[PDB]
Ligand binder design. Structure first.
Ligand code: MG
Ligand code: MG
Ligand code: MG
Ligand code: MG
Ligand code: MG
Ligand code: MG
Ligand code: MG
Ligand code: MG
Ligand code: MG
Ligand code: MG
Ligand code: MG
Ligand code: MG
Ligand code: MG
Ligand code: MG
Ligand code: MG
Ligand code: MG
Ligand code: MG
Ligand code: MG
Ligand code: MG
Ligand code: MG
Ligand code: MG
Ligand code: MG
Ligand code: MG
Ligand code: MG
Ligand code: MG
Ligand code: MG
Ligand code: MG
Ligand code: MG
Ligand code: MG
Ligand code: MG
Ligand code: MG
Lengths: 77, 220, 149, 64
RNA sequence: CCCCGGAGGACCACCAGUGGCGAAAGCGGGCGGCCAGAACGCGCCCGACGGUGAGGGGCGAAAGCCGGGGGAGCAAAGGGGAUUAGAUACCCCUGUAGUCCCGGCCGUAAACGAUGCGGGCUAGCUGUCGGUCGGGCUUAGGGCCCGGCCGGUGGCGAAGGGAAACCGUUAAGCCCGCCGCCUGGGGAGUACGGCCGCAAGGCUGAAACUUAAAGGAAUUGGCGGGGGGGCACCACAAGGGGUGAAGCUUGCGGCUUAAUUGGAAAACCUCACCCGGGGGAGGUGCAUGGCCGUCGUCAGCUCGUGCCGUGAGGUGUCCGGUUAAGUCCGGCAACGAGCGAGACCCCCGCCCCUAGUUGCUACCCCUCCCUACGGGGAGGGGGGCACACUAGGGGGACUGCCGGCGUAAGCCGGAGGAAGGAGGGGGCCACGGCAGGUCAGUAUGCCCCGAAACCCCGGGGCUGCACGCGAGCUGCAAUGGCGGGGACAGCGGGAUCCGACCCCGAAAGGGGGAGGCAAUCCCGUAAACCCCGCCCCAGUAGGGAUCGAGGGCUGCAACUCGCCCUCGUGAACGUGGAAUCCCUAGUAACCGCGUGUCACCAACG
């Protein structure tokens, strides 16, 4: 599920799966990529983000995803 | 002694060798050529500032009502352009219940300037100028630490600081005289300026400058 | 007398408190090198919050450089080891009124009640004695001891 | 202006050497060419790049 | 303190050094006498006579012991002055052994290079000491400089070695000999025995028992009453206003209570609590998600390739200048790059274009009024978008120009400019944390209550009150109080809601009701402020708590427990201790207005 985004030429992504992944203490795993802005205009308005939570056996295990397609040219040239 | 140029509106009055500097233009008349009167009554032309360093920071530019909008505090030494009579008005807006009431303070100084002229027969702008010269301190004290007990040490006061201290003592001298007694504030301010102009110890301003300079002599 | 009722500005709080109580005074003068740095009395001390400094909550200590720290516990560090409480210059208030030995005692009775204690100076201006409210009480007891017994 | 960051500096340096003969020692002409010679969707960055590229010409012309 | 003299004991300043000598301990003034041991130079003598060395012996700091002499300074013990909670310590005054000499004993030390002694081999560069040889000079000197050899004494560093620090011809390298010592920690240099000693004590030296580590070097961090630099009105300096004290509003704690509910815009409902009656607002925010606060008025965090290192890890990211910035410029084993910073996004400020059912009024005409007689003013309509206003797009500012400094990043002054150094105000919250806040916003695991949780009902409570702490209001007055008079905004809200205007009433308020579903109608002619008159330093014509009588509004309901008005009553309080908070310009402070919450009510946002 990372090479799936490597099929696309996305210049940035950020996956955050937060919960009791293996033990009773939540751990917050996260994998990121390169040219992905985090604050200012692109973030929160022009960069895709969609947070979903999935009920596993204990279960909330919220997933946060931030992606940007290969043509989402933000104001930098 | 300078190599950094100088803004316009300034003026150098080289005397012997010393470059006396005035930041405000004394020369302003109407288009006809008539003089401009403070409150429509008093003339700036005969007014002299006897003190060389204080000549730079007392703005005797002729204005009718001393009301600049508060547009000279942005830049360091921008207080040189605020007219000297408006500095007196700006120090009457205390305590906190009188802040921003410039019309009230304008009437107090105006009525005070009338009392000054009749009781003294002198130019009300001039007598206030001599109040500052007889009030502004020439030495001060500073904090110093020697490993637990903060002593003092004498220093010089810059010519801008002297004007801020003479003015504050005059206005705070008059303001305490008017609190919790029947004497009106304009009468208090008029008597305070007239006393300090005459170098009378009874005035609050002369006492304050005497204590500060007396303390400095001990703590050289 | 000067020695019995003066203190040094770095005298600890408990030391000056015990010196106040033991000698039956209203206050003492804080002097260092013949300089009257202030006074500390019982009335001003009564309303001061001295439970903090005699609880480890407010400590002063000299560094190995000379500086006086005056730190407060709980805001970061709670253990301080070999520290003092608060010197007599800290709970003192700055002196206002001084009396001359060549004067009549009546001239400072009004000032004495407001200040609680008044230092006394000689021709040189140096500290010589301290006038307390209890001294005149001793004066009043002297008359009755002279007369009625 | 206090200090020009890299994306002002990297952008300005590249535009000079690609078109070394299209930049004069005046800010006004340099502002025009930069807006036509670079994708510049920001008024401030265009002026900052144009002001800086005014300054290479002075030092380059001061060098010779 | 100064001068003239005397006596006494200890020490040998500078020169003076990783200098010298010695086996170690140790040895520092000069002259002399008696000895010792080395280095160098040598076609001198002997001819393996050597190395190490169990046991055996000798020397061996300081303190200490025995007996004698001596005793200046210092100084265990002790005496006193202070400090301190204590202070039998640290400081000060004083002080006796001791320190010094002689004869003897002790026989220990971080007695250390923590490195046994002897020999050989293995790049070098550099300082210095002794001897000697060659060359060059001569303070013509036993003197100086250059180079070689031998022997010492330091530093850097081949090969090599090492866990690493590091050693490296003065080895901890490659070898050849011999002696000593070690075999996890604690128990323990303890017990018993023996020997030694005048004694203190010394040497030699276990075990039971107990235990899973103790320990070396190095890395990242944390921390320091270690050093250096940078920065910030949630720091200070310079200021302004305050809070802390009074009365009152309000939040928490405690107290009381049947209950005063549970966490860190209250009469019902809310409601979670008490009394009576008929699925979880129950726990665990150390089981979680999401969201949020703070670190963070930060500038930090990383990656590609390279390089150092066995490794954890370094480097870049360090240094110097610069700044808001890990922003840049210049040097470096680094060269580039990404997120964060910025750029970006809203609003303010100046100019231009577009546009004028709504908004604006220069220009007209009709009325009314006044008219010093010329004119003025107000209303209605027209015309117009000119002005202003509204709203979209665009322009403008860039350290751009000038002077100085700087290699240069850039900094300081000046001019012009609406606007000047990021123009002003704000949004977006980097990695990673704070076992931070939230299962009472929703969601959710686990555990519990289980025809019992229920947003059921009636009533009460959350409003109880000696007191503590926090945030506030209005005051103490005269820069004021009161009474009349004159004004001048900007947001924002309005549907069964805003409500013009009319009537009623002394006020609160009551009745009718145009217009407006919005630049159109309304809230809406704000207060501070200005002007005039009364008050005159007094607990008062300041203050307005508390209390008595009465009148109204909302609502199903107003006592506990709502809000508004009238008349009367006039408490503390005379500017607030230790302490403490905020703030850099249209800002602080003061003044009002709109609105959220809302049936009614804001001392709150
Ligand atoms: Mg930004
Ligand atoms: Mg009064
Ligand atoms: Mg032996
Ligand atoms: Mg000895
Ligand atoms: Mg002594
Ligand atoms: Mg002795
Ligand atoms: Mg050893
Ligand atoms: Mg080894
Ligand atoms: Mg080495
Ligand atoms: Mg042994
Ligand atoms: Mg034994
Ligand atoms: Mg460290
Ligand atoms: Mg301050
Ligand atoms: Mg209070
Ligand atoms: Mg480096
Ligand atoms: Mg009820
Ligand atoms: Mg409550
Ligand atoms: Mg109640
Ligand atoms: Mg009032
Ligand atoms: Mg107040
Ligand atoms: Mg208006
Ligand atoms: Mg109207
Ligand atoms: Mg209103
Ligand atoms: Mg009264
Ligand atoms: Mg009143
Ligand atoms: Mg009633
Ligand atoms: Mg009621
Ligand atoms: Mg009344
Ligand atoms: Mg009173
Ligand atoms: Mg106060
Ligand atoms: Mg409403």
């Amino acid at each position: 599920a990372v090479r799936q985004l490597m099929e696309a030429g996305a210049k940035g992504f950020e996956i955050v799966v937060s919960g009791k992944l293996s033990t009773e203490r939540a751990k917050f795993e996260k994998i990121t990529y390169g040219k992905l802005y985090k604050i200012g205009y692109d973030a929160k308005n022009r960069v895709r983000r969609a947070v979903v939570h999935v009920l596993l056996k204990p279960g909330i295990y919220g997933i946060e995803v931030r992606i940007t397609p290969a043509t989402l040219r933000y104001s930098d040239e | 002694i300078f190599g950094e140029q100088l803004p316009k509106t300034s003026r150098v009055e080289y005397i012997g060798d010393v470059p006396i500097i005035e930041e405000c233009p004394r020369e302003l008349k109407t288009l006809d050529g008539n003089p401009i009167l403070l409150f429509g009554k008093w003339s700036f032309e005969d007014v002299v500032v006897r003190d060389p360093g204080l000549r730079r920071y007392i703005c005797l530019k002729p204005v009718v009502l001393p009301h600049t909008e508060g547009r000279y505090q942005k830049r360091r030494f921008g207080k040189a352009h605020i007219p000297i009579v408006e500095r007196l008005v700006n120090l009457l807006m205390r305590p906190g219940r009188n802040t921003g009431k410039k019309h009230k303070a304008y009437n107090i100084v105006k009525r005070a300037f009338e009392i000054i002229y009749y009781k003294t027969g002198r130019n009300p702008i001039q007598v206030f100028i001599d109040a500052i010269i007889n009030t502004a301190p020439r030495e001060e004290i500073t904090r110093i630490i020697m490993g637990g007990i903060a002593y003092s040490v004498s220093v010089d006061v810059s010519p801008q600081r002297r004007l801020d201290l003479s003015l504050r003592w005059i206005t705070e001298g008059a303001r305490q005289c008017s609190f919790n007694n029947p004497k009106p504030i304009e009468e208090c301010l008029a008597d305070e300026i007239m006393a300090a102009a005459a170098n009378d110890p009874k005035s609050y301003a002369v006492r304050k400058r005497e204590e500060l300079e007396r303390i400095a002599a001990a703590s050289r | 007398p000067a020695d019995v009722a003066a203190v040094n500005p770095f005298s600890s709080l408990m030391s000056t408190t015990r010196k106040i109580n033991a000698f039956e005074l209203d206050g003492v003068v804080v002097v260092e090198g013949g300089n009257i740095m202030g006074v500390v009395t019982v009335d001003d001390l009564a309303l001061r919050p001295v439970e903090e400094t005699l609880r480890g909550e407010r400590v002063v200590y000299f560094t190995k450089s000379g500086v006086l720290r005056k730190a407060t516990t709980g805001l970061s560090r709670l253990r301080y080891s070999k520290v003092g409480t608060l010197t007599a210059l800290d709970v003192s208030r700055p002196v206002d009124h001084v009396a001359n030995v060549n004067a009549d005692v009546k001239e400072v009775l009004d000032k004495l009640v407001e200040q609680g204690v008044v230092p006394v100076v000689d021709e040189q201006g140096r500290l010589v004695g301290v006038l307390n409210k209890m001294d005149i009480v001793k004066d009043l007891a002297r008359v009755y001891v002279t007369y009625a017994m | 202006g206090r200090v020009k960051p890299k994306f002002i500096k990297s952008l300005a340096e590249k535009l000079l050497e690609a078109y070394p003969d299209r930049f004069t020692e005046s800010f006004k002409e340099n502002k025009k060419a930069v807006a036509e010679l670079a994708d510049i969707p920001s008024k401030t960055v265009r002026n900052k790049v144009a002001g800086y590229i005014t300054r290479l010409v002075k030092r380059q012309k001061a060098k010779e």
